[PDB]
Design a protein around this ligand. Structure first.
Ligand SMILES: NC(=O)C1=CN([C@@H]2O[C@H](COP(=O)(O)OP(=O)(O)OC[C@H]3O[C@@H](n4cnc5c(N)ncnc54)[C@H](OP(=O)(O)O)[C@@H]3O)[C@@H](O)[C@H]2O)C=CC1
Ligand SMILES: [Zn+2]
Lengths: 96, 207, 129, 334, 86, 116, 137
C-alpha cells in the first residue's frame, strides 16, 4: 500500500516522507529511496476471521515452538473480534 | 548431591584461614585485616607502608614461597577517601596456593614500587600509573604504557568519561591527524538496569 | 607510629590540574548530589539506598543521516555512587565541580491498622473489601 | 529544520551548521579547502564532479557520514546543474582552468559555465550565490584569462544580482601554482622574467584566508550583492618575491632578463603538450600583471579575517623543494 | 528621581534581628499609612543578616546592614532613606 | 594528624619550586631542537610561549604534592619529545590549529547555543 | 516574538502556594532557536546598553537572594508573621462587598483539563474534555 507524495517520493509504512522543502531529499538524487512494498497493516487485514466454539481461544502464532508465546483470548464481547496481541489474527465466537 | 550448586571445600577453607592468622601474627605492624571468601580465596589487607615487607616475607619465607606475581592491578572506589585499592595476586608453586594482598592510596600519596621483590611488577605498575594515576616511588622507568602519547587524564578512573574528551581525525588543511573535542553521532545510551528489589539478603548492610 | 617521614600540608585538597579534564568541563558544569527517588511504578526501595552524583543535562540534537540522538557533552552518561552525602561532597570539592546537595527524602512512618476498616463510628470504614 | 535549517551542536564534525552548499569545482586547489571548512563544521556539502570518482577520494574524509554527496555533472548540461542546486541554500562556483582545452576555452570555464550555474541557481530558489573572480579582472589586458573573468563577473552580477563576487590575488598554498611556479625553473637555467621582475607588483594571499573569507560570506548577512577584494597584507616586487622563494627553497638564484616577445614563444613551446602545461602565454601575462589596488572594495578585514603574511607560511609550501631567511623587501603603503 | 521601593530583611528568632522585629510590630503600621503608594517589602528568612535595601530611580540600589540595631536605630535608617534620597 | 601526609619528592613549596625551574630550563632548551627534528611550521619564540603558557595556567598551586605530580608529568612529556617517541601530530596538539575559536562573551554564546 | 524555554527545558525557580521555593532541572533542551528565558533578557539588556550585573544562572540566583532571601532556600518553608499588622491596615480603607454569589471558574471536570498554554496545546487533554462531555463510544 505504498502511497506517493505530491513531489513523487514514496511514503513508507511508518508514514515517513520528506516535505517539499527538505534538503535531505538530496541523498536520493542519483540513487533510490528503499521502501518495503508489503505493508504489514494491509496484509493482516486480508486474513479471515476465525469462528471458534468457545469463550476462550489460544493463539501461538502457528508452528508451535516457531511461533510466538501462547496467549489466551477472551471472546465474550460480541461487538468486536478478539485479536491476538502478537500476530494480529482475529477470532469470533459462533453465535455467542 | 545438588547438581546445580557449587560444592564447598571446607578443607581448603580451613587451611587458608590458618595461614591468614599465621601471616597476621608474623607481621602485626602492617596487616590490618584477613578474610577468606566462600570460594576459598585468602586476602591480606595491609597498610601501604608494608608493601615491600609483606611481599618480601611471602616471597621468601619457607612456608610461603609465593614466587610468582600473577597480577597486580588497581580498583577505583570514589566513595572512599583513599579511592584506589592496589591488589597483588601471588602464586606459590611449592604449596600450590594463591594469596591476594590489598592496600590503598589516594591521588597524591605514593606507593612503594615492588620491583625489587617481583620484577614482573615493572609493567604492571606502569599500567596502574597510566590508567589510574597512582605514583609508584623508586620505579626504574615510570611512564605511560597503554595510552596515546600526550594523553591527558587517567581513563580507568570511575569519573573519566567512557568516550573520553578528544577524538582523532585527519585534517587535509594541515596534513596530519588532529585531536578535537569528542562529538558522537549517536550518544551512548545509558541503561538503568538495577532491580529495585534486594537480591542477596546475606549481604544486606545495616540501616 | 609510622617510620615514613611525613610532611604538613594545610590546604584544601584540589586535583583539578592533574586529572586531565578540560577546563570547560570543570568550571561550567553543575554537579547534583542526591539520593534517587523511588520509581513510582514499583514498590521496591533498593535503588534509594546510595547517593548519586550526576551533571547538568546539555544539548542532544538529531543526527542528519539517521535521526539518532547526538551529543557533544562528554559527561552526559557519567554517574557516580557514594555511600554518604559527605563523601560525595568531598569528591566534588577536590575535583572543582560546583554542586547542589539535596537532602534524603525518607518515607514517613505510617500508622496502619487492619481493624480500622470496620470501625463503628469513624469514617475509616471501607465500603468494599 | 523547518525554516531553512536550525544549527545544532558545538560546531564540530558531527554537528549541524545549517549550511547546505553546492560547491562546483570542489576537486581543485581552492575547492578542497572550501569543502574541508564546510564539512569540518557539520554542513551538507554537494560536490558535482566531472572527473573520475577516484579523483574525489581526498574529499570523503572531510565530513561525517552522509554530509559529502557526489554527483555527476556536465558544464554544458543545464539539467545536471539543476539537480545539484535545487536542494541547496548556497551555491559556490570554483570552476576554472589555467589553460584552454580543445573542448573548453576561457569563454566556457569563466563566462558561459558560471552564467549557466547562476541562472539555474536563481530559478531553483537558491538564496545565496558566491562567485570567484580575479583581482586583475578587466577587459583591457593581453591575458585572455583575465578578459574572460571580467565578462563573466558582469554576467554573474546580472543573472544573480544578490551574488557575492570574491576577487582574490594570486593564492599561495601547498597545492598552489604560484609559489610552486617559481620553483620549477631549475632544469632549464636561470629565472626568465619580463624586465628583471621590476615594474611588477604582486600581493599574494594565503589559501586559508581566502577559504575563511568565503565561509564568513555565507554566514554574514550584509554580504549579499557585494564585491570583495581578498589581498595579502604586504606587497612585493616580482624580483624580490621570486628571490625570496628561491632563498627559502635553498635553490641557486640566477635571474636574467628575457624579452616580452621571447617569453611568449617559450610559452607556445610548453603549451603543445596534451597534459597540464608547465607554462603558457596566458600564464606569463598574469604573473607579470600588476595586482590592482581597489580601495573601494571591502576585503578580508571586512569579514573578520586577518591576512596571513607570506613569510610566516611560505616554508610549509617550499619545504618539499629543498634538496633564518631575510624577509623580502616590501613596498611601503605610502 | 528618587526612592522607588524599600526592602527589609530579617530573621524570625535571631538575636541580631531583634531590633528590626520590634520596628515592624509597632512602627511599620504607622510608616505604611504615611506612604500608601511606596512598596515596603518585608521579607523574613532564617539565619539572614538583617538589612535595608533602598531602590532609587533607574535601578540604583543601596543597602545598609541593620545588624544588632535597636528599634530606634532602625527607624533612624528609614528616615535616612525616605528623606535623604539619591 | 590529618594534615600529615607522605611527600612525593618535595617537603615544601620552596623545594618544589626548585624542581619547577629545573623543568622549565629543560623545556626552554628543547624547543629549538624540537622545532628542528619535527620540522614544525611554528617559530621558536611561539614554541617557547606555549611552554610559558603551560607553566602559567597552573601557577596558583600551593600544595607541594600537586606540584610534584605536575613536574613528574611534565618530565614525562619532555622525555617523549626528546626521545622522538612523539610525532609531528603529538607536538602540535598543544596549538589547536584546526578548531575555530570559541567566543567567550555572553552575547556570542547566546546566539550559537544553550551552553554557558 | 522571542522563543523561550518551557519548564522542562531550564533550571528555573518556582514558589508554590505555601512559600516553598523549588527549582526545576533541564530534561531536554529547548527546541529550535529557543533560549533560556532569563538569558533572553540579559542579551536584550546588553544590546540596549543597560547590561545587567549577572552573566550566569548562579549569579542571577544571587540577585534573587538580594530581593527575597527565601527564593534560594530550596525545599524550605520560611514562616511569615505579622498577621496583626496586616489586619490593622486591612480596615483603614473600607470597601463594600458586591451582591453576586461566589462562583468558581471551574465547576465540573470539563473545566479542569485545559487551563494554560501547555494544557490547551495537548492532544490528550482535548480527548479528556471530549470524553467528559460526549462520553464513551
Ligand atoms: N588558485 C589561484 O591562484 C587563483 C584562483 N582564482 C579562481 O578560483 C577558481 C578556482 O581556483 P583553483 O581551485 O586554484 O583552480 P583548479 O585548477 O585547482 O580547480 C579548478 C576546478 O574547476 C573544474 N573545472 C575546470 N574546467 C571544468 C569544466 N569544463 N567543467 C567542470 N569543471 C571544470 C575542475 O574540475 P576537474 O579537476 O575534474 O578538471 C576543478 O575542480 C578559478 O576560477 C580561479 O580563476 C582566482 C585568483 C587566483
Ligand atoms: Zn497470535
Amino acid at each position: 500500500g505504498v502511497r506517493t507524495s505530491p513531489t513523487g517520493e514514496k511514503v513508507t509504512h511508518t508514514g515517513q516522507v520528506y516535505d517539499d522543502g527538505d534538503y535531505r531529499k538530496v541523498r536520493f538524487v542519483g540513487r533510490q529511496k528503499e521502501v518495503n512494498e508489503n505493508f504489514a497493516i494491509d496484509l493482516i487485514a486480508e486474513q479471515p476471521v476465525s469462528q471458534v466454539g468457545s469463550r476462550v481461544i489460544s493463539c501461538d502464532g502457528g508452528g508451535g515452538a516457531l511461533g510466538h508465546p501462547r496467549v489466551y483470548i477472551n471472546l465474550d464481547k460480541e461487538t468486536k473480534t478478539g485479536t491476538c496481541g502478537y500476530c494480529g489474527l482475529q477470532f469470533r465466537q459462533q453465535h455467542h | 548431591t545438588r547438581p546445580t550448586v557449587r560444592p564447598r571445600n571446607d578443607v581448603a577453607h580451613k587451611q587458608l584461614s590458618a595461614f591468614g592468622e599465621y601471616v597476621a601474627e608474623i607481621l602485626p605492624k602492617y596487616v590490618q585485616q584477613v578474610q577468606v571468601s566462600c570460594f576459598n580465596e585468602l586476602e591480606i589487607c595491609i597498610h601501604p607502608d608494608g608493601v615491600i615487607p609483606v611481599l618480601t616475607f611471602l616471597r621468601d619465607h619457607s612456608n610461603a614461597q609465593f614466587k610468582s606475581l600473577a597480577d597486580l592491578t588497581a580498583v577505583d572506589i570514589p566513595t572512599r577517601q583513599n579511592r584506589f585499592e592496589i591488589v597483588y595476586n601471588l602464586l606459590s608453586l611449592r604449596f600450590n596456593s594463591r594469596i591476594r594482598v590489598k592496600t590503598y592510596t589516594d591521588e597524591l600519596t605514593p606507593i612503594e614500587s615492588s620491583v625489587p621483590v617481583y620484577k614482573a611488577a615493572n609493567w604492571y605498575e606502569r599500567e596502574i600509573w597510566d590508567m589510574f594515576g597512582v605514583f609508584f616511588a623508586n620505579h626504574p622507568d615510570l611512564r605511560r604504557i597503554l595510552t596515546d602519547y600526550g594523553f591527558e587524564g587517567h581513563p580507568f578512573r570511575k569519573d573519566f568519561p567512557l568516550s573520553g574528551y578528544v577524538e582523532l581525525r585527519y585534517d587535509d588543511e594541515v596534513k596530519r591527524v588532529v585531536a578535537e573535542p569528542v562529538e558522537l553521532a549517536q550518544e551512548f545510551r545509558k541503561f538503568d538496569l538495577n532491580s529495585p528489589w534486594e537480591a542477596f539478603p546475606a549481604y544486606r548492610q545495616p540501616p | 607510629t609510622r617510620d615514613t617521614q611525613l610532611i604538613t600540608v594545610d590546604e584544601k585538597l584540589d586535583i583539578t590540574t592533574i586529572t586531565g579534564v578540560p577546563e570547560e568541563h570543570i568550571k561550567t558544569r553543575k554537579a547534583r548530589i542526591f539520593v534517587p527517588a523511588r520509581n513510582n511504578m514499583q514498590s521496591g526501595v533498593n535503588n534509594t539506598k546510595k547517593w548519586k552524583m550526576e551533571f547538568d543535562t546539555r544539548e542532544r540534537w538529531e543526527n542528519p543521516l539517521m535521526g539518532w540522538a547526538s551529543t557533544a557533552d562528554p559527561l552526559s552518561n557519567l554517574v557516580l555512587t557514594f555511600s554518604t552525602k559527605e563523601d560525595a561532597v568531598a569528591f566534588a570539592e577536590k575535583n572543582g565541580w560546583s554542586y547542589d546537595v539535596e537532602e534524603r527524602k525518607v518515607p514517613k512512618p505510617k500508622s496502619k491498622s487492619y481493624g480500622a476498616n470496620f470501625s463503628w463510628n469513624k469514617r475509616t470504614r471501607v465500603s468494599t473489601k | 529544520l523547518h525554516h531553512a535549517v536550525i544549527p545544532h551542536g558545538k560546531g564540530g564534525r558531527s554537528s549541524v551548521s545549517g549550511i547546505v552548499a553546492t560547491v562546483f569545482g570542489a576537486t581543485g586547489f581552492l575547492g578542497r579547502y572550501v569543502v574541508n571548512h564546510l564539512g569540518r563544521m557539520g554542513s551538507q556539502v554537494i560536490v558535482p564532479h566531472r572527473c573520475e570518482p577516484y579523483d574525489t577520494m581526498h574529499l570523503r574524509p572531510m565530513g561525517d557520514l552522509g554530509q559529502i554527496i557526489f554527483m555527476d555533472w556536465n558544464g554544458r548540461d543545464k539539467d545536471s546543474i539543476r539537480r545539484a542546486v535545487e536542494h541547496s541554500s548556497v551555491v559556490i562556483n570554483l570552476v576554472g582552468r589555467e589553460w584552454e582545452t580543445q573542448n573548453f576555452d576561457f569563454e566556457d570555464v569563466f563566462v558561459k559555465i558560471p552564467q549557466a550555474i547562476a541562472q539555474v541557481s536563481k530559478e531553483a530558489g537558491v538564496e545565496k550565490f558566491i562567485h570567484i573572480s580575479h583581482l586583475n579582472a578587466d577587459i583591457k589586458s593581453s591575458s585572455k584569462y583575465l578578459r574572460s573573468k571580467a565578462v563573466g563577473e558582469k554576467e554573474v552580477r546580472e543573472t544573480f544580482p544578490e551574488a557575492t563576487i570574491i576577487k582574490p590575488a594570486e593564492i599561495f598554498g601547498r597545492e598552489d601554482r604560484f609559489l610552486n611556479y617559481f620553483a620549477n625553473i631549475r632544469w632549464f637555467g636561470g629565472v626568465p622574467l619580463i624586465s628583471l621582475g621590476k615594474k611588477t607588483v604582486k600581493q599574494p594571499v594565503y589559501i586559508v584566508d581566502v577559504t575563511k573569507g568565503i565561509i564568513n560570506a555565507i554566514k554574514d548577512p550584509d554580504a549579499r550583492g557585494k564585491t570583495f577584494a581578498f589581498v595579502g597584507p604586504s606587497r612585493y616586487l616580482l624580483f624580490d618575491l621570486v628571490q625570496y622563494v628561491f632563498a627559502v627553497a635553498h635553490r641557486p638564484f640566477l635571474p636574467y632578463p628575457l624579452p616580452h616577445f621571447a617569453y611568449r614563444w617559450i610559452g607556445r613551446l610548453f603549451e603543445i603538450s596534451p597534459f597540464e602545461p608547465w607554462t603558457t602565454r596566458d600564464k606569463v601575462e598574469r604573473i607579470h600583471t600588476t595586482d590592482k589596488i581597489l580601495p573601494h572594495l571591502p576585503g578580508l578585514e571586512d569579514l573578520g579575517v586577518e591576512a596571513t603574511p607570506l613569510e610566516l607560511k611560505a616554508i610549509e609550501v617550499l619545504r618539499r623543494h629543498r634538496t633564518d631567511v631575510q624577509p623580502a623587501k616590501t613596498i611601503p603603503t605610502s | 528621581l528618587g526612592l522607588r521601593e524599600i526592602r527589609i530583611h530579617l530573621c524570625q528568632r535571631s538575636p541580631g534581628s531583634q531590633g528590626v522585629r520590634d520596628f515592624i510590630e509597632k512602627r511599620y503600621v504607622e510608616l505604611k499609612k504615611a506612604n500608601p503608594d511606596l512598596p515596603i517589602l518585608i521579607r523574613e528568612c532564617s539565619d539572614v543578616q538583617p538589612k535595608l535595601w533602598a531602590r532609587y530611580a533607574f535601578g540604583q540600589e543601596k543597602n545598609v546592614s541593620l545588624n544588632n540595631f535597636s528599634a530606634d536605630q532602625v527607624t533612624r535608617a528609614l528616615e535616612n532613606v525616605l528623606s535623604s534620597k539619591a | 594528624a590529618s594534615t600529615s601526609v607522605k611527600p612525593i619528592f618535595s617537603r615544601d613549596m620552596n623545594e618544589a619550586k626548585r624542581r619547577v625551574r629545573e623543568l622549565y630550563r629543560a623545556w626552554y632548551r628543547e624547543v629549538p631542537n624540537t622545532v628542528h627534528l619535527f620540522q614544525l611550521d611554528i617559530s621558536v619564540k611561539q614554541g617557547r610561549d606555549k611552554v610559558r603558557e603551560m607553566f602559567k595556567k597552573n601557577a596558583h598551586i600551593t600544595d607541594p604534592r600537586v606540584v610534584d605530580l605536575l613536574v613528574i608529568k611534565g618530565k614525562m612529556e619532555l622525555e617523549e619529545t626528546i626521545k622522538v617517541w612523539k610525532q609531528r601530530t603529538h607536538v602540535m596538539r598543544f596549538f589547536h590549529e584546526t578548531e575555530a575559536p570559541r567566543p567567550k562573551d555572553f552575547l556570542s554564546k547566546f546566539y550559537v547555543g544553550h551552553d554557558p | 516574538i522571542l522563543p523561550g524555554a518551557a519548564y522542562t527545558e531550564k533550571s528555573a525557580t518556582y514558589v508554590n502556594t505555601e512559600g516553598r521555593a523549588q527549582q526545576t532541572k533541564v530534561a531536554v533542551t529547548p527546541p529550535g532557536l529557543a533560549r533560556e528565558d532569563w538569558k533572553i533578557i540579559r542579551a536584550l539588556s546588553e544590546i540596549a546598553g543597560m547590561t545587567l550585573p549577572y552573566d550566569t544562572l548562579d549569579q542571577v540566583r544571587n540577585r534573587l537572594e538580594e530581593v527575597s532571601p527565601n527564593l534560594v532556600r530550596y525545599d524550605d518553608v520560611e514562616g511569615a508573621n505579622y498577621f496583626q499588622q496586616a489586619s490593622e491596615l486591612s480596615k483603614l480603607v473600607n470597601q463594600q462587598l458586591l451582591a453576586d454569589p461566589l462562583v468558581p471558574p471551574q465547576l465540573t471536570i470539563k473545566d479542569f483539563y485545559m487551563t494554560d498554554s501547555i494544557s490547551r496545546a495537548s492532544q490528550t487533554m482535548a480527548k479528556c474534555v471530549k470524553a467528559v462531555t460526549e462520553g464513551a463510544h
